[PDB]
Design a protein around this nucleic acid. Structure first.
Length: 105
DNA sequence: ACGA
């Protein structure tokens, strides 16, 4: 929605995310899936430099993407992972949505 | 400090 929420929902400083601890947060509310990006804010923010507002951009570089996937109700997950390019939605040169991976929508 |  916004840059602050994007960082909380999609950035991680660790590869081993504690899915069951984080996903129960109102931020995630035990949703089906959430993908994190292993990167510091500055590197991710740079991807939106020069990008038109409310449009998507695909990174040239790859990132490691820890992913929490709901396995058992109501809030139990399995940690998965993959590496790929990321597609972000930009607004005022700041990421506001994690649009897709490997390619933009 | 072993972490795609």
């Amino acid at each position: 929605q916004d840059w602050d929420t994007f960082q909380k929902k999609h950035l991680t400083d660790t590869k081993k995310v504690k899915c069951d601890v984080e996903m129960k947060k109102a931020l995630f509310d035990c949703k089906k899936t959430n993908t994190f990006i292993f990167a510091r804010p500055p590197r991710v923010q740079a991807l939106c430099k020069n990008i038109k507002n409310n449009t998507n951009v695909l990174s040239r570089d790859v990132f490691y993407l820890p992913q929490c996937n709901r396995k058992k109700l109501p809030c139990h997950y399995r940690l998965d992972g993959s590496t790929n390019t990321i597609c972000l939605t930009c607004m005022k040169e700041l990421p506001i949505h994690f649009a897709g991976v490997g390619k933009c929508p």
